[PDB]
Coordinates of C-alpha atoms and ligand atoms in Angstrom, one line a residue:
Chain J
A1 CA 0.0 0.2 0.0
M2 CA 1.0 3.4 -0.5
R3 CA -0.6 6.9 0.1
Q4 CA -1.3 9.2 -2.6
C5 CA -1.7 12.8 -1.3
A6 CA -1.8 16.3 -2.9
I7 CA -1.3 19.7 -1.5
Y8 CA -3.2 22.2 -3.4
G9 CA -3.7 26.2 -2.6
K10 CA -3.3 29.5 -4.0
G11 CA 0.3 31.0 -4.9
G12 CA 2.5 31.8 -2.2
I13 CA 0.6 30.3 0.6
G14 CA 3.1 27.8 1.6
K15 CA 2.5 24.5 -0.3
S16 CA 5.9 24.1 -1.0
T17 CA 7.7 25.0 2.7
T18 CA 4.5 22.9 4.2
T19 CA 5.1 19.7 2.1
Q20 CA 8.7 19.8 2.0
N21 CA 8.6 20.0 5.9
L22 CA 6.0 17.6 6.6
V23 CA 8.0 15.1 4.3
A24 CA 11.3 15.7 5.7
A25 CA 9.1 15.2 9.3
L26 CA 7.7 12.1 7.7
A27 CA 11.2 10.4 6.6
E28 CA 12.5 11.6 10.3
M29 CA 9.7 9.2 11.1
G30 CA 10.9 6.2 8.8
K31 CA 8.8 6.6 6.2
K32 CA 9.8 6.4 2.4
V33 CA 8.4 9.5 0.6
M34 CA 8.6 11.0 -3.0
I35 CA 8.0 14.3 -3.9
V36 CA 6.5 15.3 -7.4
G37 CA 6.6 19.2 -8.0
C38 CA 3.2 20.3 -9.9
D39 CA 3.7 23.8 -9.9
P40 CA 5.9 25.7 -13.0
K41 CA 7.9 27.5 -10.1
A42 CA 9.5 24.6 -10.2
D43 CA 11.3 25.2 -6.5
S44 CA 9.2 22.5 -4.9
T45 CA 11.9 20.0 -4.2
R46 CA 14.9 22.6 -3.0
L47 CA 15.0 22.1 0.5
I48 CA 14.9 18.3 0.5
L49 CA 18.1 18.6 -2.1
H50 CA 19.6 21.9 -0.8
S51 CA 19.5 23.2 -3.9
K52 CA 18.9 26.1 -6.0
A53 CA 15.9 23.9 -7.7
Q54 CA 15.7 21.0 -9.7
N55 CA 16.1 20.3 -13.5
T56 CA 12.4 19.2 -14.6
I57 CA 11.3 16.5 -16.8
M58 CA 10.5 18.9 -19.8
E59 CA 13.7 20.5 -19.8
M60 CA 15.3 16.7 -19.3
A61 CA 13.2 15.5 -22.0
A62 CA 14.0 18.1 -24.4
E63 CA 18.0 18.0 -23.8
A64 CA 17.5 14.2 -24.6
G65 CA 15.5 14.2 -27.4
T66 CA 12.2 12.5 -26.0
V67 CA 11.0 11.5 -22.8
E68 CA 11.7 7.9 -23.7
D69 CA 15.1 8.5 -23.7
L70 CA 14.9 9.4 -19.9
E71 CA 15.8 6.5 -17.3
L72 CA 13.7 7.0 -14.0
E73 CA 17.1 6.8 -12.2
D74 CA 18.4 9.6 -13.9
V75 CA 15.4 12.2 -13.1
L76 CA 14.4 11.3 -9.3
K77 CA 16.8 12.6 -7.1
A78 CA 17.1 11.8 -3.4
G79 CA 18.2 14.3 -0.5
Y80 CA 17.2 14.6 3.0
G81 CA 16.0 11.4 4.6
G82 CA 16.1 9.6 1.3
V83 CA 13.5 11.6 0.1
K84 CA 13.2 11.4 -3.6
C85 CA 12.3 14.1 -5.4
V86 CA 10.9 15.4 -9.0
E87 CA 10.1 18.5 -10.6
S88 CA 7.5 18.7 -13.9
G89 CA 8.3 21.9 -15.1
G90 CA 6.2 23.4 -17.6
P91 CA 6.1 25.5 -21.2
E92 CA 7.4 28.9 -20.8
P93 CA 5.0 31.9 -20.3
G94 CA 2.7 32.5 -23.2
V95 CA 3.3 29.3 -24.7
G96 CA 1.0 26.6 -24.2
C97 CA -0.7 25.2 -21.4
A98 CA 1.1 26.0 -18.1
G99 CA 0.0 22.6 -16.8
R100 CA 1.4 20.7 -19.9
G101 CA 4.2 19.5 -17.8
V102 CA 2.3 17.7 -15.2
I103 CA 0.6 15.2 -17.6
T104 CA 4.0 14.5 -18.8
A105 CA 5.7 13.8 -15.7
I106 CA 3.2 11.9 -13.7
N107 CA 2.8 9.5 -16.9
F108 CA 6.4 9.0 -17.0
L109 CA 6.4 7.8 -13.7
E110 CA 3.7 5.6 -14.0
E111 CA 5.1 4.1 -17.0
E112 CA 8.7 4.0 -15.3
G113 CA 7.6 2.0 -12.7
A114 CA 8.1 5.1 -9.8
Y115 CA 5.5 3.5 -8.0
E116 CA 7.1 0.8 -6.0
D117 CA 5.8 -1.0 -3.3
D118 CA 8.3 0.1 -1.0
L119 CA 7.2 3.8 -1.1
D120 CA 4.8 4.9 2.0
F121 CA 3.7 8.5 0.7
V122 CA 3.9 10.1 -2.7
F123 CA 3.0 14.2 -2.1
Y124 CA 1.9 16.0 -5.4
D125 CA 2.8 19.8 -4.7
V126 CA 0.1 21.4 -7.3
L127 CA -0.6 25.2 -8.4
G128 CA -4.2 26.0 -7.1
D129 CA -5.1 29.2 -8.6
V130 CA -6.7 27.5 -11.8
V131 CA -7.9 24.3 -11.6
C132 CA -7.8 23.2 -15.2
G133 CA -5.2 21.4 -17.6
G134 CA -2.5 19.4 -16.2
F135 CA -3.6 21.2 -12.7
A136 CA -6.6 19.2 -12.8
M137 CA -5.1 15.8 -13.9
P138 CA -4.2 14.7 -10.4
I139 CA -8.0 14.7 -9.5
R140 CA -9.3 14.3 -13.1
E141 CA -7.1 11.1 -13.5
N142 CA -7.5 10.0 -9.9
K143 CA -3.6 10.6 -8.8
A144 CA -4.1 12.4 -5.9
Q145 CA -6.3 10.4 -3.6
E146 CA -6.0 12.4 -0.5
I147 CA -6.2 16.3 -1.4
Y148 CA -5.0 18.7 1.5
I149 CA -5.5 22.3 0.8
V150 CA -3.2 25.0 2.8
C151 CA -5.0 28.0 3.2
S152 CA -5.2 31.0 5.6
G153 CA -7.3 33.6 7.0
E154 CA -7.2 35.7 3.5
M155 CA -10.1 35.9 1.7
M156 CA -8.4 34.7 -1.7
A157 CA -7.0 31.8 0.2
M158 CA -10.4 30.7 1.3
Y159 CA -12.0 31.2 -2.3
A160 CA -9.1 28.9 -3.9
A161 CA -10.1 26.1 -0.9
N162 CA -13.7 26.4 -2.1
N163 CA -12.4 26.4 -5.8
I164 CA -10.6 23.1 -5.3
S165 CA -13.2 21.5 -3.1
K166 CA -15.4 22.0 -6.7
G167 CA -13.3 20.2 -8.7
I168 CA -13.0 17.5 -6.5
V169 CA -17.3 17.3 -6.2
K170 CA -17.1 17.5 -10.5
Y171 CA -15.4 14.2 -10.3
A172 CA -16.9 12.4 -7.7
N173 CA -18.2 10.0 -10.0
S174 CA -15.2 8.4 -11.1
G175 CA -12.1 7.2 -9.0
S176 CA -11.6 7.8 -5.4
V177 CA -10.0 11.6 -4.9
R178 CA -11.6 13.2 -2.0
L179 CA -10.6 16.3 0.4
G180 CA -8.9 15.3 3.5
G181 CA -8.6 18.4 5.2
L182 CA -7.6 22.0 5.4
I183 CA -4.2 23.3 7.1
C184 CA -4.1 26.8 8.1
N185 CA -0.8 28.5 7.6
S186 CA -0.9 31.4 9.8
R187 CA -1.1 35.1 8.9
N188 CA -0.5 35.6 12.9
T189 CA -4.0 37.0 13.0
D190 CA -6.1 35.5 16.1
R191 CA -9.2 33.7 15.8
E192 CA -7.6 32.6 12.3
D193 CA -7.5 29.0 13.5
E194 CA -11.5 29.3 14.3
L195 CA -11.9 30.9 11.3
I196 CA -10.4 28.1 9.2
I197 CA -12.1 25.5 11.7
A198 CA -15.3 27.0 10.8
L199 CA -14.7 26.8 7.0
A200 CA -13.4 23.0 7.4
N201 CA -16.5 22.4 9.1
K202 CA -18.6 24.3 6.3
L203 CA -17.0 22.3 3.5
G204 CA -17.3 19.1 5.8
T205 CA -13.9 18.1 6.5
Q206 CA -11.6 19.6 9.6
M207 CA -8.6 21.7 9.8
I208 CA -5.8 18.9 10.2
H209 CA -3.2 21.5 11.9
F210 CA -2.5 25.2 12.1
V211 CA 0.9 25.9 11.0
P212 CA 2.1 29.4 13.1
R213 CA 4.1 31.9 11.4
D214 CA 7.8 31.6 12.4
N215 CA 10.9 33.2 11.1
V216 CA 13.0 30.0 11.3
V217 CA 11.4 29.1 8.2
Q218 CA 13.1 31.9 6.6
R219 CA 16.2 31.1 7.9
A220 CA 16.1 27.7 7.0
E221 CA 15.0 28.3 3.4
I222 CA 17.8 30.7 3.0
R223 CA 20.3 27.8 3.7
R224 CA 17.9 25.6 1.2
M225 CA 16.8 23.4 4.5
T226 CA 13.9 22.1 5.8
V227 CA 13.1 23.4 9.5
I228 CA 13.3 19.6 10.3
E229 CA 16.8 19.7 9.0
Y230 CA 17.8 23.1 9.9
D231 CA 17.0 23.1 13.2
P232 CA 15.5 19.8 14.8
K233 CA 14.7 21.5 18.3
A234 CA 12.6 24.1 17.1
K235 CA 9.1 24.8 18.4
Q236 CA 8.1 25.1 14.7
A237 CA 10.1 21.5 13.9
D238 CA 7.6 20.5 16.3
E239 CA 4.6 21.9 14.4
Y240 CA 5.8 19.8 11.4
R241 CA 6.1 16.9 13.2
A242 CA 2.5 16.9 14.5
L243 CA 1.0 18.0 11.2
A244 CA 2.8 14.9 9.9
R245 CA 1.7 12.4 12.6
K246 CA -2.2 13.6 11.8
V247 CA -1.8 13.5 8.0
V248 CA -0.7 10.0 8.7
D249 CA -3.3 9.1 11.2
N250 CA -6.0 10.9 9.4
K251 CA -9.0 8.5 8.5
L252 CA -11.4 11.5 7.3
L253 CA -11.6 11.8 3.7
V254 CA -14.7 13.1 2.1
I255 CA -16.3 14.7 -1.2
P256 CA -16.7 18.2 0.1
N257 CA -19.6 20.3 0.1
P258 CA -18.3 23.8 -1.4
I259 CA -20.1 27.2 -0.1
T260 CA -21.6 30.2 -1.6
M261 CA -19.8 33.5 -1.8
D262 CA -22.4 34.5 0.9
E263 CA -21.4 31.8 3.5
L264 CA -17.7 32.7 2.8
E265 CA -18.2 36.7 3.2
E266 CA -20.7 35.8 6.5
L267 CA -17.4 33.7 7.7
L268 CA -15.2 36.8 7.4
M269 CA -17.6 39.4 9.0
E270 CA -18.0 37.3 11.9
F271 CA -14.2 36.5 12.6
Chain W
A1 CA -8.1 57.7 -29.3
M2 CA -8.3 55.2 -26.5
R3 CA -5.9 53.5 -24.2
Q4 CA -5.6 50.1 -23.6
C5 CA -4.8 49.2 -20.1
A6 CA -4.1 45.8 -18.3
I7 CA -3.5 45.2 -14.9
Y8 CA -1.9 41.8 -13.9
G9 CA -0.6 40.4 -11.2
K10 CA -0.9 37.3 -8.6
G11 CA -4.1 36.4 -7.1
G12 CA -5.0 38.3 -3.9
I13 CA -2.6 41.0 -4.6
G14 CA -4.9 44.0 -5.1
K15 CA -5.8 44.0 -9.0
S16 CA -9.3 44.4 -8.6
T17 CA -9.3 46.8 -5.7
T18 CA -6.2 48.9 -7.4
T19 CA -8.2 48.8 -10.8
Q20 CA -11.5 49.9 -9.6
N21 CA -10.2 52.7 -7.4
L22 CA -8.0 53.8 -10.1
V23 CA -11.0 54.0 -12.7
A24 CA -13.3 55.6 -10.2
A25 CA -10.3 58.2 -10.1
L26 CA -10.3 58.5 -13.6
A27 CA -14.2 59.3 -14.1
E28 CA -13.5 61.7 -11.1
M29 CA -11.3 63.4 -13.4
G30 CA -13.8 63.2 -16.2
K31 CA -12.9 60.5 -18.4
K32 CA -15.0 57.7 -20.0
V33 CA -13.8 54.1 -18.8
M34 CA -14.5 50.8 -19.4
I35 CA -13.8 47.6 -17.2
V36 CA -13.3 44.1 -18.5
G37 CA -13.3 41.5 -15.8
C38 CA -10.9 38.7 -16.8
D39 CA -10.4 36.6 -13.5
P40 CA -12.7 33.6 -13.1
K41 CA -13.5 35.0 -9.2
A42 CA -15.9 37.6 -11.3
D43 CA -15.5 40.5 -8.7
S44 CA -13.8 42.9 -10.8
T45 CA -16.5 45.2 -11.0
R46 CA -18.5 44.9 -7.9
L47 CA -17.4 48.3 -6.1
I48 CA -18.0 50.4 -9.0
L49 CA -21.9 48.6 -9.5
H50 CA -22.2 48.5 -5.7
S51 CA -23.2 44.8 -6.3
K52 CA -22.6 41.9 -5.1
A53 CA -20.6 40.9 -8.1
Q54 CA -21.8 40.8 -11.6
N55 CA -23.5 38.1 -14.2
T56 CA -20.8 37.0 -16.6
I57 CA -21.1 36.5 -20.3
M58 CA -20.7 33.3 -20.4
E59 CA -23.8 32.7 -17.7
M60 CA -25.5 35.2 -19.8
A61 CA -24.9 33.6 -23.3
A62 CA -25.7 30.2 -21.8
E63 CA -29.1 31.5 -20.3
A64 CA -29.9 33.3 -23.6
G65 CA -29.0 30.5 -25.9
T66 CA -26.0 31.8 -27.8
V67 CA -23.8 35.2 -27.7
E68 CA -25.0 36.3 -30.7
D69 CA -28.5 36.7 -28.3
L70 CA -26.6 39.1 -26.4
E71 CA -27.1 42.5 -27.1
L72 CA -23.9 44.8 -25.8
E73 CA -26.6 47.2 -24.1
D74 CA -27.9 44.3 -21.8
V75 CA -24.5 43.1 -20.8
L76 CA -22.6 46.4 -20.2
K77 CA -23.6 48.0 -16.8
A78 CA -22.8 51.4 -15.7
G79 CA -21.8 52.3 -11.8
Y80 CA -20.1 55.2 -9.9
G81 CA -19.2 58.0 -12.6
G82 CA -20.7 56.4 -15.5
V83 CA -18.1 53.6 -15.6
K84 CA -19.0 50.8 -17.8
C85 CA -18.7 47.1 -16.3
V86 CA -18.4 43.8 -17.7
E87 CA -17.4 40.3 -16.5
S88 CA -16.0 37.2 -18.6
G89 CA -16.8 34.5 -16.5
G90 CA -15.2 31.0 -16.9
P91 CA -15.8 27.5 -16.7
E92 CA -16.3 25.8 -13.4
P93 CA -13.4 24.2 -12.0
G94 CA -12.4 21.1 -13.3
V95 CA -14.0 21.4 -17.1
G96 CA -11.9 23.5 -19.9
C97 CA -9.5 25.9 -19.6
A98 CA -10.2 28.6 -16.6
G99 CA -9.3 31.4 -19.3
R100 CA -11.9 30.3 -21.8
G101 CA -14.4 33.0 -20.9
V102 CA -12.1 35.8 -21.6
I103 CA -11.7 34.9 -25.1
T104 CA -15.4 34.9 -25.6
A105 CA -15.8 38.2 -23.9
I106 CA -13.3 40.3 -25.4
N107 CA -14.1 38.8 -29.2
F108 CA -18.2 39.9 -28.2
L109 CA -16.8 43.3 -27.1
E110 CA -15.0 43.8 -30.1
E111 CA -17.7 42.4 -32.6
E112 CA -20.4 44.6 -30.8
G113 CA -18.7 47.9 -31.1
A114 CA -18.4 48.6 -27.5
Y115 CA -15.0 50.1 -28.1
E116 CA -16.4 53.7 -29.0
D117 CA -14.4 56.6 -30.0
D118 CA -15.8 58.6 -26.7
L119 CA -14.5 56.1 -23.9
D120 CA -10.8 57.3 -23.4
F121 CA -9.6 53.9 -21.4
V122 CA -10.5 50.4 -21.4
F123 CA -8.8 48.4 -18.4
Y124 CA -8.7 44.7 -18.6
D125 CA -8.3 42.9 -14.9
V126 CA -6.5 39.9 -15.4
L127 CA -5.4 36.8 -13.4
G128 CA -1.8 36.3 -13.7
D129 CA -0.9 33.3 -11.7
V130 CA -0.6 31.5 -14.8
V131 CA -0.1 33.3 -18.4
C132 CA -1.8 30.9 -21.0
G133 CA -5.2 30.5 -22.5
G134 CA -7.6 33.2 -22.3
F135 CA -5.3 35.0 -19.5
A136 CA -2.4 35.1 -22.4
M137 CA -4.7 36.2 -24.9
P138 CA -4.8 40.0 -24.1
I139 CA -1.2 40.0 -24.9
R140 CA -0.9 37.5 -27.6
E141 CA -3.8 39.4 -29.6
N142 CA -2.9 42.9 -28.9
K143 CA -5.5 44.0 -26.9
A144 CA -3.8 45.0 -23.4
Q145 CA -1.2 47.8 -25.1
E146 CA -0.4 48.9 -21.5
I147 CA 0.4 46.2 -19.0
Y148 CA 0.6 47.7 -15.2
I149 CA 1.6 44.9 -12.7
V150 CA 0.4 45.1 -9.4
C151 CA 2.8 43.4 -7.2
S152 CA 4.6 43.8 -3.4
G153 CA 7.8 42.6 -1.9
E154 CA 6.3 39.1 -1.7
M155 CA 8.8 36.8 -3.7
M156 CA 5.6 35.3 -4.6
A157 CA 4.4 38.4 -6.5
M158 CA 7.6 39.4 -7.8
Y159 CA 7.9 36.0 -9.5
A160 CA 4.4 36.6 -10.9
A161 CA 5.7 40.3 -12.3
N162 CA 8.5 38.5 -14.0
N163 CA 6.4 35.7 -15.6
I164 CA 3.9 38.3 -17.0
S165 CA 6.8 40.2 -18.5
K166 CA 8.5 36.8 -20.1
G167 CA 5.3 37.0 -21.6
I168 CA 5.3 40.2 -23.2
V169 CA 8.4 39.4 -24.4
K170 CA 7.4 36.3 -26.3
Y171 CA 5.0 38.7 -28.1
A172 CA 7.0 41.6 -28.8
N173 CA 7.5 40.8 -32.4
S174 CA 3.7 41.3 -33.3
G175 CA 1.5 43.6 -31.9
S176 CA 2.2 46.6 -29.7
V177 CA 1.6 45.2 -25.9
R178 CA 4.0 46.7 -23.6
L179 CA 5.0 46.9 -20.1
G180 CA 3.6 50.2 -18.5
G181 CA 5.2 50.0 -14.9
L182 CA 5.0 48.3 -11.7
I183 CA 2.2 49.4 -9.0
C184 CA 3.4 48.3 -5.3
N185 CA 0.4 47.5 -3.4
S186 CA 2.3 47.5 0.4
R187 CA 2.7 44.9 2.9
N188 CA 3.6 47.8 5.2
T189 CA 6.9 46.8 5.4
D190 CA 10.0 49.3 5.1
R191 CA 12.0 49.7 2.5
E192 CA 9.3 48.1 0.2
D193 CA 9.2 50.7 -2.1
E194 CA 12.9 51.0 -2.2
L195 CA 12.4 47.0 -3.5
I196 CA 9.8 47.5 -5.8
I197 CA 11.7 50.4 -7.6
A198 CA 15.1 48.3 -7.9
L199 CA 12.8 45.6 -9.6
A200 CA 11.3 48.0 -12.3
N201 CA 14.9 48.8 -12.9
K202 CA 16.3 45.6 -13.4
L203 CA 13.1 45.0 -15.6
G204 CA 13.5 48.3 -17.6
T205 CA 10.7 49.8 -16.1
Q206 CA 9.7 52.1 -13.3
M207 CA 7.4 51.8 -10.1
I208 CA 4.4 54.1 -10.8
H209 CA 3.1 54.2 -7.5
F210 CA 3.1 53.0 -4.1
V211 CA -0.1 52.0 -2.8
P212 CA -0.2 52.2 1.1
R213 CA -1.9 49.8 3.2
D214 CA -5.1 51.4 4.6
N215 CA -8.1 49.8 6.4
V216 CA -10.4 52.4 4.9
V217 CA -10.0 50.1 1.8
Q218 CA -11.9 46.9 3.8
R219 CA -14.6 49.8 5.3
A220 CA -15.1 51.0 1.7
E221 CA -15.6 47.4 0.0
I222 CA -17.8 46.1 3.0
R223 CA -20.2 48.7 1.5
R224 CA -19.6 47.7 -1.9
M225 CA -17.4 51.0 -2.6
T226 CA -14.5 52.1 -3.7
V227 CA -12.7 54.6 -0.9
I228 CA -13.0 57.4 -3.8
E229 CA -16.9 57.0 -3.4
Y230 CA -16.7 55.8 0.0
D231 CA -14.6 58.7 1.6
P232 CA -13.5 61.4 -1.2
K233 CA -11.5 63.2 1.6
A234 CA -9.3 60.2 2.5
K235 CA -5.7 60.2 2.5
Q236 CA -6.0 56.4 0.4
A237 CA -8.5 58.6 -1.6
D238 CA -5.6 60.8 -2.8
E239 CA -3.1 57.8 -3.3
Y240 CA -5.5 56.4 -5.8
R241 CA -5.8 60.0 -7.4
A242 CA -2.2 60.1 -7.7
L243 CA -1.6 57.0 -9.3
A244 CA -4.4 57.3 -11.9
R245 CA -2.8 60.9 -12.8
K246 CA 0.5 59.1 -13.4
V247 CA -0.8 56.5 -15.8
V248 CA -2.5 59.3 -17.5
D249 CA 0.8 61.0 -17.6
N250 CA 2.9 58.0 -18.3
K251 CA 5.0 57.8 -21.2
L252 CA 7.3 55.1 -20.7
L253 CA 6.2 51.7 -22.6
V254 CA 8.8 49.0 -22.7
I255 CA 9.6 45.3 -23.8
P256 CA 10.8 44.4 -20.3
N257 CA 14.0 42.6 -19.5
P258 CA 13.0 39.6 -17.3
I259 CA 15.8 38.6 -14.7
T260 CA 17.0 35.5 -13.3
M261 CA 15.9 33.8 -10.3
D262 CA 19.4 34.8 -8.6
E263 CA 18.7 38.1 -9.4
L264 CA 15.3 38.0 -7.5
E265 CA 16.5 36.5 -4.6
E266 CA 19.6 39.0 -4.4
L267 CA 17.2 41.5 -4.4
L268 CA 14.9 40.0 -1.5
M269 CA 18.5 39.2 0.3
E270 CA 19.8 42.5 -0.1
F271 CA 16.3 44.6 1.2
Ligands
ADP1 N1 4.7 29.0 8.7 C1 5.6 29.8 7.9 N2 6.1 31.0 8.4 C2 7.1 31.8 8.1 N3 7.2 31.7 6.6 C3 6.6 30.6 5.8 C4 5.5 30.2 6.4 N4 5.1 29.0 5.4 C5 5.8 29.6 4.3 N5 6.3 30.8 4.7 C6 7.1 31.6 3.6 O1 6.2 31.7 2.7 C7 6.8 32.1 1.2 C8 5.7 31.2 0.2 O2 5.9 29.9 0.4 P1 5.6 28.6 -0.5 O3 5.6 27.4 0.3 O4 6.9 28.8 -1.3 O5 4.1 29.3 -1.0 P2 3.8 28.5 -2.2 O6 4.5 27.1 -2.7 O7 2.1 28.3 -1.9 O8 4.1 29.0 -3.5 C9 8.3 31.1 1.4 O9 9.2 32.5 1.7 C10 8.3 30.7 2.7 O10 9.4 30.7 3.4
ADP2 N1 -3.7 49.2 -0.5 C1 -4.9 48.1 0.2 N2 -5.0 48.7 1.7 C2 -5.8 47.7 2.2 N3 -6.4 46.8 1.8 C3 -5.8 46.5 0.3 C4 -5.1 47.0 -0.2 N4 -5.6 46.5 -1.3 C5 -6.0 45.2 -1.3 N5 -6.5 44.7 -0.2 C6 -7.4 44.1 0.0 O1 -6.9 43.1 -0.4 C7 -7.8 42.0 -0.7 C8 -7.4 41.4 -1.9 O2 -7.5 42.6 -3.2 P1 -7.8 41.9 -4.7 O3 -7.8 43.5 -5.5 O4 -9.4 41.5 -4.4 O5 -7.0 41.2 -5.1 P2 -6.9 40.3 -6.7 O6 -7.9 41.1 -7.3 O7 -5.5 40.7 -6.9 O8 -7.5 39.1 -6.0 C9 -9.2 42.3 -0.6 O9 -9.8 42.2 0.3 C10 -8.5 44.1 -0.7 O10 -9.7 44.9 0.2
SF4_3 S1 -5.8 28.3 -17.8 FE1 -3.4 27.9 -18.7 S2 -4.0 27.0 -20.8 FE2 -6.3 27.1 -19.7
SF4_4 S1 -3.6 26.0 -17.3 FE1 -5.8 26.3 -17.4 S2 -6.2 24.7 -19.3 FE2 -4.3 25.4 -19.2
MG5 MG1 5.6 26.3 -4.4
MG6 MG1 -9.5 40.2 -8.4

């Protein structure tokens, strides 16, 4: 068995920082994990690899001729805790569908046998400002079984969570893609945890963890590390360990019930 | 003559608040303006119309049969200062290209003669987290002659500015789409103005205005108004008037010079 999780959310909300720190905590626990970057920014694996970023499947396929000239062992790279890392890439801005590289990457990984029985988790880090093209592919094509949405008390972040939830509903008749929870990545506003708990309740899910805003994140990332590796004693390291434990133990996976714009505004009004 | 401007930027950065307040200041000055919403959130005209949002061209076309059954005078709605407003709409999440409604809307407006000689400005409010499909159409198809990018000291906002700039470069051999400037929408961090001035200089443009963070914006928008209408005496109203004056007077329109990720990180490091 292997659990396939996808982290969605609006741009800049904290998907890649949260995913890489969660995954480092899983590896610290002894789990075997692969991260698949599905955001054109292509920096979803840099903190595991200690790297600038990672060269993408689209880039490597072009340098090699075709994607068939690539071998899995030349594309997947291991970093902290043995976590295996790959980046999809995407076309340059203004040409082609920004999500086209996700389709190529996921099909390549499936065909080349990357989903070996010994992996415990796969995490996809997916752009969520639009739910279409290759960014909808993990949902449409049944790859992202458990979706976790990173969000905050920001209206745009909550709207994005509702939009992703609508995409999950639209494919509910095929496959098994479900909403696993919301992750609140704090803006250091109070009642913010209560706000995201309320939103999760209205959608029919739960807020799995509240991640505090902590400057140790920046100090770690300047050095191309997760907090888990940079300062294993940090309070924020323990926050990521708690998030990872709760993902492991989570049993609530639902077809969410998206809300109206009036419900979303009323939530912000109240809190 | 009529100037065609497009406001791009990452989600939640302030495009719609900045555009509607800028446009209200233009109308207060006596200009005739149309706003074309090109973001699926479809709330780009609500502060001019005093409305919840606006029903979209895609929605109205479906209720009416075809887009040809729609008349311009039934779709365009006037609000504060006579500003004319239209929303593109888009398909539901998980179906079709999130930008498909922009193509339908802009072609409809062109064919129906919405670009009447007496308009002074058209502003497109465009999602900028991906530059593809209908969101690239204003650049690819020469509709958005002057692009202004709303951004902030946030790394993701600056990355989005660089991505949009790359899209402008890619179509530089056809049409006349150019970068007009950056608009800094403050996160209330200091040296932030100097940071965005530096980024503009590296791209070859200018930072046209620094918009402060001011709670009067929220108090206005709770009442579905621009600050210009809600409190014409407010300091923030004068900030939007200054931005509008500088857009009117702006003569610098360039093919930008996108920067590397190393240059972008060095900028953040320094400031
Ligand atoms: N809990 C946190 N505390 C402090 N900084 C954070 C936190 N989460 C994210 N950040 C910072 O926010 C910025 C954006 O996060 P990132 O994970 O890259 O967003 P995304 O992948 O959603 O675009 C990064 O500079 C990151 O270091
Ligand atoms: N200068 C500002 N001061 C205070 N709040 C602002 C300012 N600019 C934007 N906001 C708030 O930020 C939120 C997002 O702005 P919006 O224009 O809707 O973003 P976008 O259209 O880019 O998604 C809105 O609640 C808006 O009221
Ligand atoms: S939104 Fe990107 S290509 Fe359809
Ligand atoms: S990114 Fe949306 S459909 Fe191509
Ligand atoms: Mg990311
Ligand atoms: Mg908007």
